[PDB]
């Protein structure tokens, strides 16, 4: 491992290199400026980002001794010998040379003093404080500490003079992902038909290790087709398939469609794939949505040239059965950004604090796998008015809303977190969410027009065998006040009548055989629509339509 | 045990077998490709699916060293002894030969390290992290883990290098259950009458061990039929198909064992009148579950929900009982106000749990009696309990229509006040057909009278046409 | 007994279960009776402690894991089964749940006859009428 | 006493009850008196916390289980029996629930006569009339 292994964060790499070499390579400039260089440095960030790799690389280029201390391996069996073990390790590290010391998993020895309730841990942490303090200027030894989460650190360890400089090893950008891909793919037999730029342009939230997972998965897939064709039979080995081996692009596509970022698998969503042709109608609305979602994620230079802060939230409102959840599905599957699905009441919990912890965790993952699109469906469940009634049942709902506002208002151009809102009753939405600067643009989804409705019918009956001589414009003109859900219901009833006809025809055929084509016609007939129209209704009453119209007017 | 024991999951058998054997049979090929194979895998799914069975099969077939770690076994009382045990285990596995570690019930030893408040557990998980990755992480060894709640693991442990590949050993399909039955009936002696295909079709939610239990119960029934010891009876047992029918009619899937309904005995002939509604219900329930090829031929998902509404006692709960008793799909009978709780969020937690059971043991039918009790209008109540009812109805809306899979859940609602239902529930997609159940007419009243008098002796000359003509506004209850 | 197995030291309750099962398997084809099991088998999802969850996982792996059990049968008794981990309510661990419910008139007569067979009754007492007039008695 | 058996550590209250009952059964036929049983016998399923459920189950096992008791008698005292676990209010655990309620005029007269046996009175003192005016005074 070397300087060419760690990748992405070039400026951070330069900063850490300066920090670790200069007080060990050239201390004359430190004396000239007049500052004593620090002895401890922290690096933090999401797990699997490259912290340990960078520390090992630093231990490699510099010939200074590298003493790794596994966090959970510092205790001992006999009463009070772990302290002696740590002390003798540290004294050998100092006495031997101006070495480099790496303490892994500091969190194991930093439980914030509140959830400790022990005494051996207290003794070990205090011993570490004394050993860290007892570092003379002549030692010329510096410690690098590795923490998975930054907020579980003892501030006593964070005080100046012991551990002062932290570095947020964050998510590499597109160039960082491309270069790390090159680093991993340079030691492989790569076929010519490869474009790593596309892979480093379609991968968004991946950080450090999942790229390696991607590579391994692709290699495995290649092994799959070459094993299926070779058919070694598990009784010998040949010597021609190995040299006739080339990694394709379709395997990379398969790996991309298979794996997801290592952080978001805890919230993996079941694969439902809906194309932009599934959302019939709403052409201008879909165009506006595309413009709103593609610009912040692809044109930062345009954003700078405009000089206007883009909105970082949006609210869909309208009558039930119009397609809000459908647009959410379409964005989730083919928007080219991460997506975490959450249900409103799902997060709330009966214990004290757990609810706010859940909001904090979901938004932490959202910021980690940036860019992302957090879909809040049925927003009126968690975001209601505040102080509506004296009986606030402990004010937990108010506390949750305050947590959502305080932890969502800490946004900026960075982290690219786009919030999709979706509510059925906008009247109960809190005005705090609706104030300008937080969720400004509002999209009202109206009832479909006759043309839009014909498009909806064609989009719902796309993958359905249908008669040659049949039209849908009559149905569209007839179902004047219908909604998308109603159109789904009518087509479903027609299909149900068709399957009934098919099964009765098959039963009659079997009977006459007892005493080839499966049905008299595999396609849905016009008569099925004709006699499936007697049972449809209209989803939303005129009162609900009037209320939504008034809300749009105001 | 071998590869002929684990049944119903071809993909998972192939994935685990290749991952465990191919890097330990042709390492040169993986040096030729250049990269190392995945080396840690976590098997997850509902209990009684075959995770431990797969581990046993791998241990028996592969000739390499195998070390087994039950979860709590590592911990000990003396300070810093659990980590010593883990280090000793890893060293023993590595030193002798290339080996396979198997950690059963990892949830006991790998908490989230964020909600826990102990000390020893957090050091044991940190020690596991260091052993799985770091300086001198691991050589020529593979790690398999088994769990029932993959979400109860700290995410830092489930990254590449520790557990890169996730195999999902879930509920089987009809073909999977048929294959499992064929495996489990390979050693007993069966009569010719048994037909496993129909039995697998009717086993709508059984997973793994459930099938084994069914077989055992059938055999026991056969044992207690020909025991009312000489070799004459020791030979010629002959597990009949009737034994299997009885055991299937007695057992229920373990998933729904929590919410097993009391055995009420009604039949379709008990429901007088409403012939067309009865046929409609038959058509809407039995077609998606028995004839999926035609639905996929047309490329449309089936209709699921239905709502009965009408005057009290017209026969709504009677239809629900008939569905519960004379339908192959599983039944979840749920009360209206039973699911509410005094705590904060426990109503929606219970609703989510109920629907999780329904979607787990699919195809399933859930009966919502008095839908107007929990699903009322939204925001009408001024003085409320913090909008708990509002959150309940929103939870129902998202659970019945959201980011779900829409595999097979049939919701039937029964309320006599259809004006108090939230209009967001009445739209197609959740409760898409509303069936009015009107008061019986004369030909329905006569049918009802015969329906309830089919087990009663009557005078031969007693004609019921006069009674039917005499009751005009009456209902079935009357 | 239900709560009798757990001790304050970390990692000793599971050791007690290990010892119990190992003795049962080492001695003979045995029967293990666990009384009031609801106290050592919660759902691991509503509980928040650590020793209880770990004990539950120990029980699951000890009754059904690799080389699970050899000719030893497990009996359990509880007053409420719904507060038990679903992973324990499965074939292999708890094969079948018997419902010992409220006796009917004949059951009450049998209970009365067995319980009044060692005392010196008078000649004027019949037990069928007494079993008829006693209605909701659980035995 | 109620809170005197509980301890901080997990799995020690039950040890306290075990040793207490063992001491009771070690030597002679013994009488146990648990004052304020409602403080350590809550209604199961109505409480949040495994320790209360465990101590309730341990008490149930101790009083009525396999080889339950030998010539040992148990007495409890509570103010609100309705808050006691119903499994505890069965024959074999708490079979005779005696109601020590408000005395009547005669009982309160007895109370006055016993209380004024060590006190020095005046010649012109009667307790029957004094007992008559008091109505609700208990003990």
């Amino acid at each position: 491992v070397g300087y060419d292994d760690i990748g992405g964060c070039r400026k951070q790499m330069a900063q850490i290199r300066e920090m670790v070499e200069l007080p060990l390579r050239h201390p004359q400039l430190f004396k000239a400026i007049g500052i004593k260089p620090p002895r401890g440095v922290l690096m933090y960030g999401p797990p699997g980002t490259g912290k340990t790799l960078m520390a090992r690389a630093v231990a490699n280029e510099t010939g200074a001794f590298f003493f790794l201390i596994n966090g959970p391996e510092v205790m001992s069996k006999m009463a009070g010998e772990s302290e002696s073990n740590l002390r003798k390790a540290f004294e050998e590290a100092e006495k031997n040379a101006p070495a480099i010391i790496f303490i892994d998993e500091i969190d194991s020895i930093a439980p914030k003093r509140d959830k400790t309730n022990g005494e051996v841990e207290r003794r070990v942490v205090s011993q570490l404080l004394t050993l860290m303090d007892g570092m003379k200027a002549r030692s010329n030894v510096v410690v690098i500490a590795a923490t998975n989460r930054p907020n579980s650190i003892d501030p006593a360890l964070r005080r100046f003079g012991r551990f002062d400089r932290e570095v947020d090893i964050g998510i590499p950008d597109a160039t960082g992902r491309l270069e790390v891909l090159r680093i991993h793919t340079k030691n492989m037999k790569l076929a010519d038909d490869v474009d790593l730029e596309a892979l480093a342009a379609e991968t968004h939230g991946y950080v450090g290790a999942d790229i390696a997972s991607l590579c391994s998965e692709a290699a495995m897939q290649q092994i799959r087709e070459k094993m299926d064709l070779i058919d070694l039979d598990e009784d010998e080995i040949d010597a021609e398939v190995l040299d006739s081996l080339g990694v394709t692009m379709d395997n990379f596509r398969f790996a991309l469609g298979n794996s997801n970022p290592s952080a978001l698998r805890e919230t993996v969503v079941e694969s439902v794939n809906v194309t932009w042709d599934d959302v019939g109608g709403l052409d201008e609305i879909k165009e506006e949505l595309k413009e709103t979602v593609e610009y912040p994620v692809l044109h930062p230079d345009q954003y700078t040239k405009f000089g206007l802060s883009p909105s970082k939230g949006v609210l869909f409102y309208g009558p039930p059965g119009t397609g809000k959840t459908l647009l959410a599905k379409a964005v989730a599957t083919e928007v080219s950004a991460n997506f975490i699905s959450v249900k409103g009441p799902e997060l709330l919990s009966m214990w004290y604090g757990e609810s706010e912890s859940n909001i904090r965790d979901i938004f932490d993952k959202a910021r980690a796998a940036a860019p992302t699109v957090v879909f809040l469906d049925e927003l009126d469940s968690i975001a209601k008015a505040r102080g509506g009634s004296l009986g606030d049942a402990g004010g937990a709902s108010d506390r949750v809303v305050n947590q959502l506002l305080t932890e969502m208002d800490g946004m900026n151009a960075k982290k690219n977190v786009f919030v999709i809102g979706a509510t059925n009753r906008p009247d109960q939405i809190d005005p705090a969410i609706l104030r300008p600067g937080r969720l400004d643009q509002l999209i009202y989804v109206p009832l479909p027009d006759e043309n839009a409705r014909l498009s909806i019918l064609n989009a719902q009956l796309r993958k359905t065998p249908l008669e040659p001589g049949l039209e849908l414009t009559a149905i569209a003109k007839a179902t004047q006040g219908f909604s998308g859900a109603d159109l789904l219901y009518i087509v479903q009833r027609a299909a149900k009548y068709a399957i009934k006809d098919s099964i009765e025809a098959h039963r009659q055929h079997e009977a006459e055989k007892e005493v080839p084509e499966v049905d008299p016609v595999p396609y849905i007939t016009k008569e099925h629509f004709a006699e499936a129209m007697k049972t449809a209704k209209r989803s939303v009453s005129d009162a609900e339509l009037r209320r939504y119209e008034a809300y749009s007017q105001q | 045990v071998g590869y002929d024991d684990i049944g119903g999951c071809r993909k998972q058998m192939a994935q685990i077998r290749e991952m465990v054997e191919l890097p330990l049979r042709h390492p040169q090929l993986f040096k030729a490709i250049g990269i190392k194979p995945p080396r840690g895998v976590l098997m997850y799914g509902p209990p009684g699916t075959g995770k431990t069975l797969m581990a046993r099969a791998v241990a028996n077939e592969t000739g390499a060293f195998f070390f087994l770690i039950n979860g709590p076994e590592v911990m000990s009382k003396m300070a810093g002894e659990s980590e010593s045990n883990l280090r000793k285990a890893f060293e023993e596995a590595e030193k002798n030969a290339p080996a396979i570690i198997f950690i059963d019930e990892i949830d006991s030893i790998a908490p989230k390290r964020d909600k826990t408040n102990g000390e020893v557990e957090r050091r044991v998980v940190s020690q596991l992290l260091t052993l799985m990755d770091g300086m001198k992480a691991r050589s020529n060894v593979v790690v398999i883990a088994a769990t029932n709640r993959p979400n109860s693991i700290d995410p830092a442990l489930r990254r590449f290098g520790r557990f890169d590949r996730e195999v999902d050993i879930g509920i089987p399909d009809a073909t999977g259950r048929l294959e499992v039955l064929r495996i489990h009936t390979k050693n007993m002696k069966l009569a010719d009458d048994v037909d496993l295909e129909a039995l697998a079709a009717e086993t709508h939610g059984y997973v793994g061990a459930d099938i084994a239990s069914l077989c055992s119960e059938a055999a026991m029934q056969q044992i207690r039929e020909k025991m009312d010891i000489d070799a004459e009876v020791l030979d010629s047992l002959g597990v009949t198909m009737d034994n299997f029918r009885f055991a299937l009619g007695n057992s229920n899937p373990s998933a729904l064992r929590e919410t097993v309904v009391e055995s009420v005995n009604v039949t379709w002939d008990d429901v007088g009148g409403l012939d067309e509604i009865k046929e409609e219900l038959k058509e809407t329930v039995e077609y998606p579950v028995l004839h999926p090829d035609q639905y996929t031929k047309f490329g449309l998902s089936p209709s699921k929900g239905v709502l009965f509404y009408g005057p009290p006692g017209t026969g709504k709960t009677l239809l629900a009982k008939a569905v519960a008793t004379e339908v192959s799909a599983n039944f979840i009978s749920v009360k209206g106000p039973e699911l509410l709780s005094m705590w904060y969020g426990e109503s929606e937690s219970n609703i989510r749990d109920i629907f999780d059971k329904a979607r787990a043991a699919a195809p399933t039918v859930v009966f919502l009696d008095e839908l107007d009790s929990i699903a009322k209008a939204r925001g009408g109540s001024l003085g409320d309990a913090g909008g708990a009812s509002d959150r309940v109805v929103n939870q129902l809306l998202t659970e019945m229509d959201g980011m779900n899979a829409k595999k097979n859940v049939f919701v039937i609602g029964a309320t006599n006040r259809p004006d108090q239902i939230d209009p967001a529930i009445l739209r197609p997609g959740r409760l898409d057909q509303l069936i009015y159940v009107p008061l019986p007419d004369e030909n329905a009243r006569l049918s009802i009278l015969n329906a309830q008098l089919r087990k009663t002796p009557l005078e031969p000359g007693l004609e019921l046409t006069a009674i039917a003509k005499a009751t005009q506004g009456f209902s079935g209850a009357d | 007994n239900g709560p009798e197995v757990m001790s304050k030291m970390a990692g000793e309750s599971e050791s007690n279960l290990r010892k119990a099962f190992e003795e049962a398997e080492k001695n003979a084809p045995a029967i293990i009776f666990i009384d009031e099991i609801d106290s050592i088998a919660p759902k691991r999802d509503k509980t928040n402690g650590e020793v209880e969850r770990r004990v539950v996982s120990q029980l699951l792996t000890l009754m059904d894991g690799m080389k699970a059990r050899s000719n030893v049968v497990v009996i359990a008794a509880t007053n409420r089964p719904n507060s038990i981990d679903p992973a324990l309510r499965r074939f292999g661990r708890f094969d079948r749940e018997v419902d010992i419910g409220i006796p009917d008139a004949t059951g009450r007569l049998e209970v009365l006859r067995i319980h009044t067979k060692n005392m010196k009754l008078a000649d004027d007492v019949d037990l069928e009428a007494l079993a008829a007039e006693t209605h909701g008695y659980v035995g | 006493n109620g809170p005197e058996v509980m301890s901080k550590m997990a799995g020690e209250s039950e040890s306290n009850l075990r040793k207490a009952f063992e001491e009771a059964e070690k030597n002679a036929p013994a009488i146990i008196f648990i004052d304020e049983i409602d403080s350590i016998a809550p209604k199961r399923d109505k409480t949040n916390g495994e320790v209360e459920r465990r101590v309730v189950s341990q008490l149930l096992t101790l009083m009525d289980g396999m080889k339950a008791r030998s010539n040992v008698v148990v007495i409890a005292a509570t103010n609100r029996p309705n808050s006691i676990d119903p499994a505890l209010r069965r024959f074999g655990r708490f079979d005779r629930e005696v109601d020590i309620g408000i005395p009547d005029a005669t009982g309160r007269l007895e109370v006055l006569r016993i209380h004024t046996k060590n006190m020095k009175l005046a010649d012109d003192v009667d307790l029957e009339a004094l007992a008559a005016e008091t109505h609700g005074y208990v003990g």
Binding site: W351, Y352, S389, A393 | - | K8, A10, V51 | -
Partner: peptide, 23 residues
């Protein structure tokens, strides 16, 4: 020699109440 010890203390929940209005 030293030894460890386990401890599980308690938890605290939140309830929900219903109120009555007078129009």
């Amino acid at each position: 020699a030293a030894a460890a010890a386990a401890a599980a203390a308690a938890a605290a929940a939140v309830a929900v109440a219903v109120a009555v209005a007078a129009a």
